[PDB]
Design a binder for these strands. Structure first.
Lengths: 113, 84, 131
RNA sequence: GCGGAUUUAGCUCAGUUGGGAGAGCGCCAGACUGAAGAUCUGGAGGUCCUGUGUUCGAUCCACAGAAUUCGCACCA
RNA sequence: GCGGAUUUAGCUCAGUUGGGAGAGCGCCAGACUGAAGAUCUGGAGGUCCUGUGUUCGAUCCACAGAAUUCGCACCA
RNA sequence: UCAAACCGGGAGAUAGCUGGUUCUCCCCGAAAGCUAUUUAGGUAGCGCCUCGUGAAUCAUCUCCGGGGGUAGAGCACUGUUUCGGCAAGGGGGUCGACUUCCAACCCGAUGCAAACUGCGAAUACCGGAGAUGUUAUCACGGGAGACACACGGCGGGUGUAACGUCCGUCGUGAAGAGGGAAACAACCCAGACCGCAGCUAAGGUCCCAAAGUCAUGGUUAAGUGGGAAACGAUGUGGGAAGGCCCAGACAGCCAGGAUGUUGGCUUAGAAGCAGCCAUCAUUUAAAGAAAGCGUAAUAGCUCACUGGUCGAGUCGGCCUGCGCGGAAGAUGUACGGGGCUAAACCAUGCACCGAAGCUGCGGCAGCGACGUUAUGCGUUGUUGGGUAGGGGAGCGUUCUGUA
RNA sequence: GCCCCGGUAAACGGCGGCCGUAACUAUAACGGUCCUAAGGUAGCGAAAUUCCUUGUCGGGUAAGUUCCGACCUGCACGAAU
RNA sequence: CAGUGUCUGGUGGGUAGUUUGACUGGGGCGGUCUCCUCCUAAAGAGUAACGGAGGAGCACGAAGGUUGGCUAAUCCUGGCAUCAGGAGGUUAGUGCAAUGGCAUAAGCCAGCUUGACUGCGAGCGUGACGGCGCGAGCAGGUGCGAAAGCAGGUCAUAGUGAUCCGGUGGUCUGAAUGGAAGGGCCAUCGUCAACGGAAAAGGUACUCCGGGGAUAACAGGCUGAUACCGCCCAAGAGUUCAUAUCGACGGCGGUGUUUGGCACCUCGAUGUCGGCUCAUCACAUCCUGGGGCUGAAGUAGGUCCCAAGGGUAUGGCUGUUC
RNA sequence: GGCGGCCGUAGCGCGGUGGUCCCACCUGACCCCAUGCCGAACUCAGAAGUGAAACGCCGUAGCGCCGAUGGUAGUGUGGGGUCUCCCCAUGCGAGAGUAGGAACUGCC
């Protein structure tokens, strides 16, 4: 078969769909950072939390740094464990290393994922 | 060096390909069929090729690619006996 | 005879050519021939040149089918040399109901006498059609 | 008809790392000689069989055609 | 495969004193001849197979590799 | 006796070379590929005959789940190739506009292909389930023949060609009766126990000849009854379509068919009528400066057109059925004969003769099933052609046992 | 003994092609140019040894691929093959 | 010197054998016998011929792997080398004869790096059959990557070959012991490219025998391209005038006397050409006779049909047939 | 614009219109970080100016693709004649033609 438009952009991952589990997409914005736990077959979002929502707790500083990306990971993951999910793979479509995505992943494990 | 004299292919021998893998009985995770080498994707029964369709069935065993862009090269999604 | 062309070797030239008549207006007349047959370029010239040499009154005479199927021959012994292109040049394939020569003309037929002269040159019983 | 060889500047011929067209002789001229000769030097002289195809570019590849030559075949 | 010889300036070759690279021919020039020839004189032309090692320094030692040639071996 | 002695001797030399190879009956009944072999008209493991053992459930004639892409078709690689329109380039003539020619591109109509395609079979074919079948399929092992099919027709491929090599379809020689087709390997129909009865098939059914000179309808007339062709034909029959038709036409018969002009040009000459261009005008009911014949050139004779008379079917054209022209040669000529208007032939149909066919009465074999120790009987399904070859029974025979 | 060089062809042998001059035309004759060194002058030569060749000219005959004489580039004739 | 005995190397027709394969439009000459990849093979499979087209017998540490960036041909514009912009699934390129695959790519550029690891099984090649190859696991471990994952060389299908012997890597092995020389299991490398594979060439008219049509040179038969003849259309020549002789181009046929010639018939053999001599059975003819066309005015001729009724009776060179 | 469902008729082109809620452009590069030569890439920051390239809606069906109603040629298959060849029975029907879909649907 040919390479779908998505495969050409290599943003997706078929190797994580062969397992039949969930993902941990990490959206990044020059103002905010977002994370989700979408499941196969469309865009089924079970749990998610934005850095802007972190303010609801008691956030003061900017929401576009590293320490903020780690705070969101603990929130999205905490809510995930409350849902019923245990395992999850990391899905960072295009990005560098040691960036905010790594801090997001390291935060997810800190919760229990 | 370069090629010349336009034409189709270039004549060979007798086709060496079969169709092993009943995929309705016991099936160890291995190449189900034989025609063209190199190809992956299908981990179970995924017989799906342009036309009236394709199919296979029953056999609990992780992974099980096909031959290549031939008898249903597409990769479906899981399948086993009925209660392994 | 499996239809043929070239993509092989260059043979003789066209004994035909002169389409004749003016093509500023496309008509829908003709001279159908009941029966399939292969006509060589030469015989096509004799028939075409026959009517054209008679329709001096006017023109608008045209032909749709042309020879595009070569045919080789072989003179002498045999054992080395598929076939060469000799007298047997291109040949046209005519269908049981195909229109060959059509002249753009309203009921004033002065070429029926011309088509008749040509109808006696091609190996096939042709018939005159008004439509 | 078949196969092999050959088909480069007037003549006789070299030239496959595909990317320089060259040698001997001849012709013209210079030089020299009283001068002519002969050397010697210089120049001119080549659709490098033909067309097409292939390559960034082929005399030097592939295909087709033509000519020459040889062997063979044919010849009440 | 094994062994011997050979592998110096275009060509044919000398050169083991390890410390000069040279000769003949050829090429160019000079002298000469009216001139050309041939002598004769002069000049140019050498990664002296390649690398490494040995020595102060080696074409001329040792080792390794390559070329050429011959004998031999193989050539189901 | 010598391009090499005779005799005997170690030869009943070695051969992938030829020939040879003899009694009866019963059952079944071929093939011409692969790997290897000092092997290729030889075996072994295997495609095929037969027998014993072993295992086990399909197989395929079907259906169902896959793989291929040929024929054909479409329109397609490539290399040719038809026309028109549009845009760009080059060359020539006159104006920087246009006209003409050539090559490449696109579109529509046209289309092209031994090496293609927007589409697309039949069909063969891998794996798994069924009606059918239940023990077939399939797994093992032993003993073989074996890897030199060909020919005719049709369609081919290679082939410049020989009583081919090599594929495809069909059909036979193979393993086929009987039978007609006049005779006949294959065309049509249909398949062999015995004796016998009936009814059908092949074919035939007027006579020899056994069976209706049978039924309905039609054609041909040619005796065609069978070679026959590219080509011609008011021989004849049938059908559709245009125009002219009874307020005197379309065709016959009678008479006109003219004047400038022997139109110009050209031509030895052409004065309607070689050819080259025009083709107007005149008198007027009609008469083309003339459609043909004719002359060396004129002349002459018709037609077109009009009048009278004639008073009726006529004229141009398309298609279909059958026969025909294209056809001269061999000691006596005809369908098997007689001969038949059907005792032919064509389109159908019916009854019979006619096979060892089919059915019925008295007498079989092989295989499988049931019961059985039984391959002995009884019953049941299939019942019975055969070369090469396989298997089995049998009797003629000699001598020596025991009765 | 042989490689080495040389002698020896009464050693096995090799002797193709081209231009010019010159002729009414073709050839022979002479020199060169090239290839492989020479390329053939005595005689005699298509002769039982030349294909092409019934070669060319001619005798002879009504005519003779026969024969004889000459020329002769000598396909694959030529020296005690 | 010798004579001579024995042995080794070289030279050595002076002497003896077709042993040196096959296919093949008889044979010979010319072309082909290993292997890969269209068409032919007629939609699986498999499938031939001196069947039409074209190649492999090696090359390479990189044309290996991974990652980042990038994306091509070709055409147009401004300046064929370059650079900037636009169009552009891609026709580029990807080692190799072709098909198939691929572009935010297996393509290009750059950097980095190097899994061409060891051991052992299951599966794949209708129908049993080895070496070899490939797809897919497991156990222990090398490289790169974050990791999954990717490798058993270069995208896949040609680039290869036994036994004996020799040269190379651990062990085992011969009255009794030491020192040596010798004898195997697995694997790699070296040659056979007339390439499943011999160490190396040739005539044969004195012929014989055992066989076979599975072997040609003739006659017959098929075909008829060639050959002979006719027909259709008809340019043109003919002072003018196609059609009154001649008659091109092209098309359509007949005969089979000619020739080339597809091997079922005969080579377990109908000995060869022509002539000669002798017997038997027929017709596509020159004159004469009767006719058709006429470049037939007349005359004289040209061509064609018919006709055997009569007559075809002779020499020189050559064996020769025309 | 947010938030869902259905979930390849959402391939690919093309038109109108709206929200300063939202969003790319744009703007600025002090720093984290980064380009072999180029903060273009990469990464960070602020928001002057638009909608010229998203998104929300909504209008054409070109072309790709997926379905539906109608039918000639072609073709599967078994008997008939006939010089070749053609015909009949029966299952379908080239390819052309007429139409369907450019989203659909809930909530703030």
């Amino acid at each position: 078969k040919k390479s779908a438009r998505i495969r050409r952009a290599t943003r997706a991952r078929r190797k994580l769909q062969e397992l039949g589990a969930t993902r941990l997409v990490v959206h990044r914005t020059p103002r905010h950072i977002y994370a989700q736990v979408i499941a196969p077959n469309g865009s089924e979002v079970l749990v998610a939390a934005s850095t802007v929502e972190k303010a609801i707790a008691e956030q003061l500083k900017y929401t576009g740094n590293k320490d903020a990306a780690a705070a969101v990971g603990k929130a999205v993951a905490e809510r995930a464990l409350e849902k019923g999910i245990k395992d999850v793979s990391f899905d960072r479509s295009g990005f560098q290393y040691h960036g905010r995505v790594q801090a997001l992943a390291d935060a997810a494990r800190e919760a229990g994922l | 060096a370069h090629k010349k004299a336009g034409g189709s292919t270039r004549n060979g021998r007798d086709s060496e390909a079969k169709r092993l893998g009943v995929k309705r009985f016991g099936g160890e995770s291995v190449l189900a069929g034989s025609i063209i080498v190199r190809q992956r994707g299908t981990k179970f029964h995924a017989g799906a090729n342009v036309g009236c369709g394709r199919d296979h069935t029953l056999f609990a065993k992780a992974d099980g690619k096909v031959k290549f862009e031939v008898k249903g090269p597409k990769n479906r999604k899981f399948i086993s006996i009925e209660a392994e | 005879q499996p239809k043929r062309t070239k993509f092989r070797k260059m043979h003789k030239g066209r004994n035909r050519g002169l389409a004749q008549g003016t093509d500023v207006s496309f008509g829908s007349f003709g001279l159908k021939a009941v029966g399939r047959g292969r006509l060589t370029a030469r015989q096509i010239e004799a028939a075409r040149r026959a009517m054209t040499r008679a329709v001096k009154r006017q023109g608008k005479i045209w032909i749709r089918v042309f020879p595009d199927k070569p045919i080789t021959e072989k003179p002498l012994a045999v054992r080395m040399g598929k076939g060469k292109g000799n007298v047997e040049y291109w040949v046209a394939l005519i269908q049981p109901g195909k229109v060959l020569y059509e002249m753009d003309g309203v009921p004033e037929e002065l070429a029926r006498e011309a088509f008749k002269l040509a109808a006696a040159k091609l190996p096939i019983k042709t018939t005159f059609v008004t439509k």
